[PDB]
Design a protein around this ligand. Sequence first.
Ligand code: HEM
Ligand SMILES: CC(C)[C@](O)(c1ccc2cc(OC(F)F)c(OC(F)F)cc2c1)c1c[nH]nn1
Length: 471
Amino acid sequence: LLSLPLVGSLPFLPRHGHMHNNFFKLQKKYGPIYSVRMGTKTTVIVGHHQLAKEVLIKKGKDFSGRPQMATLDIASNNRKGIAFADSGAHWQLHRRLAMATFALFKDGDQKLEKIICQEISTLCDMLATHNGQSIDISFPVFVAVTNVISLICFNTSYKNGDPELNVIQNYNEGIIDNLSKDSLVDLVPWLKIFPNKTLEKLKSHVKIRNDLLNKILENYKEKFRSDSITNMLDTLMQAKMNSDNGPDQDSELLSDNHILTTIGDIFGAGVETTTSVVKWTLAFLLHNPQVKKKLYEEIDQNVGFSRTPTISDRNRLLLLEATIREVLRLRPVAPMLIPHKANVDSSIGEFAVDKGTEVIINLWALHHNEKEWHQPDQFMPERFLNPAGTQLISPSVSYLPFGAGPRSCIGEILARQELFLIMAWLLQRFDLEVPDDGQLPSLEGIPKVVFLIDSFKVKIKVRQAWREAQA
Ligand code: HEM
Ligand SMILES: CC(C)[C@](O)(c1ccc2cc(OC(F)F)c(OC(F)F)cc2c1)c1c[nH]nn1
């Protein structure tokens, strides 16, 4: 009695549980490196820190391209910008200029810390008007970190109640929704098998996004002074200037669509991800009041109420720095990075990997590795401190929240500051507690282009100690 023909097989149900954890459950059967084939496209999944560091660092440039996706093609205006562009001059140029702009914000009145502490102060007043109420702090934080990103790109910020802030939130919410139904890792190309409006809806929100950035770029051309370089849009237009003296090879790379999409990748990435981490950290502090207490005690002991937090306070506020590290471990912004692609025939762990092969780092597996992490499913900021509690450690090498190699986060500095500063300023001012209905946020989360958390509310009272310190 024979056996049936078999035209296809998959090791686990599609659209059942989260992708990254399904790949990770799978290492028990098939190991830390294994592949899957859809027609002609082939995808490798890496889930051990050593092989991941080979893809990202040692052979970093070999695996530094990005794969063509129909949904990502739109959000990037056909693979322009940075995050979703293939390895090339465009990507190399724009990524370089983008980083050069962050250099401008080391010193002065445009000192990055000053810009942040500024928009954080407005945030804290805004939140104090809700003393005694339970609220969803998504939008107030969204506006804070939009203004920072907007000051670095434009030297502009949105005044309060501006209706554009609600427009931006809308198309951001729309891009996130149609860009993926899970992480950017669909085994099955569902949107080509069945008819659907997914791409049509996406174009709408990107169209709004693109038209809006376009207005801003036209208005700025009058205002541009070659002698005044203080934001990203300057760095980009200066580049276009120095190229067209006829034009250089760099000229075709700095058209207004290439400049537009670059800003849109800075904005799109920076804002929604920084906001998500803030929501994720409060989520964890509401589940772990014991950690919350030691964080209040630490910040009262080392900063007080005579002044506001400063980057300088990073050296004394250690448990806070560890808590941010432990949230980015348990809940990586990008539990599977962005897909890398093999630019050239190569090898991972001495296995052959053909040109054009989608390679995926399963960061979720690196951060939950039983052997590399003690009690990996637990929230223990202690694990990033010596047993004393007096300086920070790197307890494991299987920890790359911002990735590594040629394709790592370019806004790592900015995020590490914002996340520290925001969280300091709030813990100083505010008591943060479970609302009166008694509901706690769900830490399960929601994988999209960003690893998001279900919306949740928090009761917020100004702190006893902070009041009495005003006389
Ligand atoms: C806690 C905050 C953040 C985390 C954990 C994070 C993490 C990451 C990761 C894992 C990648 C991809 C790594 C890879 O594909 O190899 C990435 C890419 C990127 N991030 Fe972030 N990121 C954060 C915040 C930001 C911020 C605030 C910005 C603001 C500009 C930003 C801009 C970018 C860009 C432009 C890329 C694409 C780089 C490229 O493809 O060359 N990120 N980030
Ligand atoms: C891990 C990575 C996928 C990402 O989450 C990321 C990167 C670029 C994004 C660009 C967006 O704008 C437009 F191009 F689609 C975007 O749209 C929406 F959020 F508004 C979301 C984006 C998310 C990220 C974030 N930080 N570092 N990497």
